Design a protein around this ligand. Structure first.
Ligand SMILES: CC(=O)Nc1nnc(S(N)(=O)=O)s1
Ligand SMILES: CC(=O)Nc1nnc(S(N)(=O)=O)s1
Ligand SMILES: [Cl-]
Ligand SMILES: [Cl-]
Ligand SMILES: [Zn+2]
Ligand SMILES: [Zn+2]
Lengths: 223, 226
């Protein structure tokens, strides 16, 4: 069958049934997303640059932009190369039970195959020029307009870091999550646009059981 | 049948012996680990002890360990969650490594709350002064009924430094979602206590090798146990 976000046979409460591959979606004790609500206050380097997408496409219910392996985040002496950035409407992670209309995930992998994913919400407000090459380029196959990855995130960020899982099947654990507290802005026309291309259909996995995930809250400079 | 020797049933093959033991290989948050990257933090009063001297319901050898079980009269309260102490058992050598450094012995204080959530407390021993606290266990195991009270309210240090993370049981079925608190400060043990303890664990190492670490989030803090 084909996993989706509907309230029926293939929906999130039933991903585990569709494939044995997806069983950890139910049996796992560190599944994402969660409500980030209880945490501790208290080594992250960015190597992003304007990058022309390898491809920009709609896949498995998300708007996805893939990249050549030229961008990295270095964490605790290991490089995690950015594979792709994709979008969720609404945001999957809740910070103290507050949702944003959109979020973006920056998905990275190190040499051992370990995953590090960075999440950040969007706020309804002013236009965000960075969204445009992705929105302009679903429409193309070839020389894509560069995504300003080095301008995308806040210069100064406050983040929550915890151990979790992929928020979509096969829901693999061992994902190093960094969730940024600061919203980016997106216009009313851009959001409606982005939400419409993901078929006016919510692609937000519900909050999963939280087994007292150890979450630290900190801050860093992205540039 | 699972064991710690280098043949069919050893640590490398636990996932193969039973399908319940599959998370022993497939898990992304398996224990023990080398504790070497961690975050320093506040003393948020998260961890409060309600311990008292307790006579073991039993002291016995099971699954390569020497175990003392207790009545549900002892607690750990964490972040507004109460965990009742189930048992104390031993590992030789110590399973969690602190900054890649060895210990000859460790103790795990295994707790379970009403929902079945697991919290385990670990502390190492070093060769030195004799430890009187171990003696009712060494003395109580060649006996079967009346066990001497274990001074649970005295076993741990009054002031502790610990590392807290979520991990797994270090023995099959390697269940994850285990709340680990590893106390950095060691307790003491004599050469005779260490040797007999090992003989009561049949002079056979019951130490799980270190498993892969997927960027485990560890906070380092401190508390007063009494
Ligand atoms: C190739 C790839 O990135 N696959 C992903 N599956 N789930 C993800 S999520 N919502 O946890 O970021 S990413
Ligand atoms: C009943 C019981 O306590 N079972 C345990 N299995 N593994 C444990 S450990 N070494 O992670 O503390 S405890
Ligand atoms: Cl998110
Ligand atoms: Cl230990
Ligand atoms: Zn995502
Ligand atoms: Zn143990």
């Amino acid at each position: 069958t084909k996993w989706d976000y509907k309230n029926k046979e293939n929906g999130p409460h039933r991903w585990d049934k569709l494939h044995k591959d997806f069983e950890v979606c139910k049996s796992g004790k560190s599944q994402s997303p969660i409500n980030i609500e209880h945490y501790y206050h208290t080594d992250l380097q960015f190597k992003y640059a304007a990058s022309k997408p390898k491809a920009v496409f709609f896949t498995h219910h998300t708007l996805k932009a893939s990249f050549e392996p030229t961008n990295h985040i270095n964490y605790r002496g290991h490089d995690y190369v950015l594979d792709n950035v994709h979008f969720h409407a609404p945001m999957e992670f809740l910070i103290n039970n507050k949702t944003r209309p959109l979020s973006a995930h920056f998905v990275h992998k190190d040499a051992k195959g370990r995953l590090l994913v960075l999440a950040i919400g969007f706020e309804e407000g002013k236009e965000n020029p960075n969204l445009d090459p992705i929105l302009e380029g679903i429409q193309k196959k070839q020389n894509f307009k560069e995504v300003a990855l080095d301008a995308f995130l806040p210069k100064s960020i406050n983040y929550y870091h915890f151990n979790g899982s992929l928020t979509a099947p096969p829901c693999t654990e061992g994902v190093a999550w960094f969730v940024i507290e600061e919203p980016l802005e997106v216009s009313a026309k851009q959001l409606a646009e982005i939400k419409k291309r993901m078929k006016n259909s919510p692609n937000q996995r519900p909050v999963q059981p939280d087994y007292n995930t150890v979450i630290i809250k900190s801050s860093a400079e992205t540039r």
